[PDB]
Amino acid sequence: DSKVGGNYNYRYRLFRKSNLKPFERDFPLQSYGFQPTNGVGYQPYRVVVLSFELLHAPATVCGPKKSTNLVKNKCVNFNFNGLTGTGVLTESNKKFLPFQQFGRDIADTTDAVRDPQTLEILDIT
Amino acid sequence: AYTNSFTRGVYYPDKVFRSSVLHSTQDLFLPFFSNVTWFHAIHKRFDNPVLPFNDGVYFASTEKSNIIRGWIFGTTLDSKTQSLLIVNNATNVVIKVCEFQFCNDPFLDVEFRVYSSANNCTFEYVSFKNLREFVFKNIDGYFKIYSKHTPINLVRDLPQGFSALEPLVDLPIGINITRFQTLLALAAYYVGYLQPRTFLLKYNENGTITDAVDCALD
Amino acid sequence: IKQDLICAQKFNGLTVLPPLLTDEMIAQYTSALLAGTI
Amino acid sequence: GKIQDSLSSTASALGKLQNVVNQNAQALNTLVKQLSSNFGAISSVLNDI
Ligand SMILES: *[C@@H]1O[C@H](CO)[C@@H](O)[C@H](O)[C@H]1NC(C)=O
Ligand SMILES: *[C@@H]1O[C@H](CO)[C@@H](O)[C@H](O)[C@H]1NC(C)=O
Ligand SMILES: *[C@@H]1O[C@H](CO)[C@@H](O)[C@H](O)[C@H]1NC(C)=O
Ligand SMILES: *[C@@H]1O[C@H](CO)[C@@H](O)[C@H](O)[C@H]1NC(C)=O
Ligand SMILES: *[C@@H]1O[C@H](CO)[C@@H](O)[C@H](O)[C@H]1NC(C)=O
Ligand SMILES: *[C@@H]1O[C@H](CO)[C@@H](O)[C@H](O)[C@H]1NC(C)=O
DSSP states (O other), rough: OOOTOOOOOOOOEOSSSOOOOOOOOOEEEEOOOOOOOOOTTSSOOOOOOOOOOOSSOOOOOOOOOOOOOOOOOOOOOETTTEEEOOOOOEEEOOOOOOOOOOOETTTTTTEEEEOSSSSSSSOOO | OOEEEEEOOOOOSSBOOOOOEEEEEEEEEOOEEEOOOOOOEEEOOEOOOOOOSOOOEEEEEEEOOEEEEEEEEEEBBBSOEEEEEEESSSOOOOEEEEEEEEEOOOOOOOOOTEEEEEEEEEEEEEEOOOEEEEEEETTTTEEEEEEEEEEOOOOOOSSSOOOOOOOOOOEOOOOOOOEEEEEBBOOOEEEEEOOEHHHHHEEEEOOOOEEEESSOOO | OOOOOHHHHHHHHHHHHOSOOOHHHHHHHHHHHHHHHO | OOOHHHHHHHSSGGGGHHHHHHHHHHHHHHHHHTTTOOOSSSOOTTOOO
16 A cells, blocks of 8 residues: 555544544544655554454354254353353243343343344253 | 423333342433423424434324324434434335435425435335334444334323333444434324433333332432 | 242352251240240 | 230331341342452453453
């Protein structure tokens, strides 16, 4: 991105009345002097920020891990969409509304989970 | 006009099931007994003004014959910036985020005279006797819509009762919203402004919250 | 015998031991003392 | 007999007892409630960390 003539298509906001709020987007706009002869620190550098948000909400994006057959009555190590723990899994009558996927106890600890493969609510003890 | 919002504006704050427990939660909720603004659809009266949208808004609609049919959200509403348009037309429900060019008075007829141009479209999806409670919220690029329907037999006021609100859809529109305007078909509709408040919710054994308490009402 | 607030307390390692003298032996002691007094 | 009606009528006469038992629960309650506290970390749950 450092054409010899000067890649002036890239530019930054030089002046602004006040500091902008986080994750906001908007002569106040001045072009970068990107040229191939520019030294280190002055060269063009591309930047990509992965701002993934992970509050307990239906997850949709994550890495390659093979799911396996779910077992009941026998307490095991478990990991549901990154939520790791250990306990027994039992059929639960606690009717999650169609948006709920996890349930938490008084101790801010998980006690009910909705399986990401079968839409069933299971109690963890 | 103004009306006392006796017991409304409450929604499930999170996606966690609880039962027989009192839970405290800080979230953008509608304060109880507030002066919600009242608009009418008579005969004569067809007011559809543009209302500011800050910190989320609670909408209530006492309707018969399905008069209220959508909403628009934006900050300029003149194609200079993006805008989110939600419509429930006679075939289906359509949501669409584009730099729409809007008319001064957008409305539907039983026509679709709501916008005149759609330059840059990014997100798109296509699917008194009644009362509809909605709570709209725009947080960090995600626009959440809570929605509940309830039968009523009342003439010209919001019923005095309690009913929790359940989320239906969350949209990654990511657009700047400052104002909004409801879409009418050619009933009554109340608008209230949400504030950051701490609440106390009473879950019953069935898990449906039955009572709500303010921490700062009095 | 655990097989709710009580269950939530218990699960985190906060267990309750039973008193040695159950209510029956306490009632027997009370009855004995009462009979002696009367 | 007056005692029998009194204990059948009022519930506060046994306050000195309930004040004990309630506290035994209440302290336990807050002893669990501190689990939700983060104490300055980025998350208050161990498995998350
Ligand atoms: C959103 O629009 C309003 C009104 O035009 C403006 O005051 C505000 O700065 C905008 N926010 C961002 C992040 O651009
Ligand atoms: C994923 O799970 C659902 C529900 O069990 C099932 O209907 C679907 O066929 C599954 N898809 C794949 C690719 O396994
Ligand atoms: C609501 O209306 C009453 C009566 O006119 C007025 O006294 C009060 O200040 C209003 N409150 C709000 C929040 O607008
Ligand atoms: C309703 O809106 C959808 C989406 O734009 C459109 O395809 C459909 O034709 C509309 N129906 C009517 C009756 O206008
Ligand atoms: C709308 O799209 C046109 C064509 O790509 C572009 O020139 C213009 O900058 C866009 N407007 C926006 C993104 O606000
Ligand atoms: C729970 O729902 C059942 C089924 O309608 C009902 O019989 C019962 O009274 C409800 N209990 C509570 C506390 O809401």
